[PDB]
């Protein structure tokens, strides 16, 4: 796990996320592990009211 700060699907997470928190949204990714990383990331390293829906 290193791609955290790298690709722009994470930089997007913010600029999109950083003002459009008001409404709720639905994101669908690859599989479990991939989204287990996001949770670690976003919930904290950006700082969102985020939760986990895996399988």
């Amino acid at each position: 796990a290193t791609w955290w700060n790298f690709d722009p699907r994470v930089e997007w997470l913010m600029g999109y996320l950083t003002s459009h928190r008001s409404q709720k949204v639905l994101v669908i990714c690859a599989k479990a592990a991939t989204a287990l990383q996001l949770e670690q990331v976003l919930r904290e390293r950006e700082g969102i009211r985020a939760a986990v829906f895996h399988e």
Partner: protein, 227 residues
């Protein structure tokens, strides 16, 4: 009866901090009215640029510390607090400070951005000792007024902040000292008169000039319900 209207004669710059300002002519018993009233705004109020938020890699809470650093986190929070900053366009700005090696860490080690102009390029922020370590940090600067510390900011919000985003209390107010003198004006028409000299000291984040014009605006702004 006709009212004399006082004006500006000369601005005496002594430093980027200190400046006197001479004013004539004011009628009898008015040097005490304004000079006092001006000062009361000039301290209480006044929109200076100051530090609010900081994030650092490898740090969790303010009460911990980083290796190869003489000073503590709260100490570096404390040194950030009393900073001098200038902003041209937008209100809220995000700075990036990256320094490494032996010796001190002055502000001139921050990335010189367009709108960003620093007043003291030899101010003390932090110290380093060992030459196999460094410090990277995202600092946030804002324009406000008065004193909204970190404490009142932890109870007017509910979206929640992340871990690492520390909070310094904000020293928005720029001026650190002010007085006002009351001397006798010699106009070449009338000798009864006085003139108002206002001494000031500050961090340079707002100019000695605007400051005065900006405060007397605020003063008058309050008077607009009685005209």
């Amino acid at each position: 009866t006709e009212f004399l209207k006082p004006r500006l004669v000369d601005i005496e710059q002594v430093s980027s901090t200190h400046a006197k300002v001479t004013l004539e002519p004011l009628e009898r018993g008015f040097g005490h009215t304004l000079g006092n009233a001006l000062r009361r705004i000039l301290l209480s109020s006044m929109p200076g640029c100051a530090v609010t938020e900081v994030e650092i890699d490898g740090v969790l809470h303010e009460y911990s510390t980083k290796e190869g650093v003489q000073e503590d986190i709260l100490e570096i929070l404390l040194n950030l607090k009393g900073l001098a900053v200038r902003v041209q366009g937008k209100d809220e700005v995000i700075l990036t400070l990256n320094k490494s090696g032996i010796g001190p860490v002055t502000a001139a080690d921050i990335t010189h951005d367009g709108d960003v102009e620093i007043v003291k390029p030899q101010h003390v922020i932090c110290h380093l000792t060992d030459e196999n370590a460094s410090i990277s940090m995202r600092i946030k600067v804002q324009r406000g007024r008065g004193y909204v510390p970190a404490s009142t900011r932890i109870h007017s919000e509910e979206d929640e902040r992340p871990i690492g985003r520390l909070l310094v209390d904000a020293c928005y107010s720029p001026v650190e000292r002010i007085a006002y003198n009351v001397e006798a004006a010699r106009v070449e028409q009338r000798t009864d008169l006085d003139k108002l000299v206002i001494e000031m000291e500050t961090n340079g984040t707002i100019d000695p000039e605007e400051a005065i014009r900006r405060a007397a605006t605020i003063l008058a702004e309050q008077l607009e319900a009685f005209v």
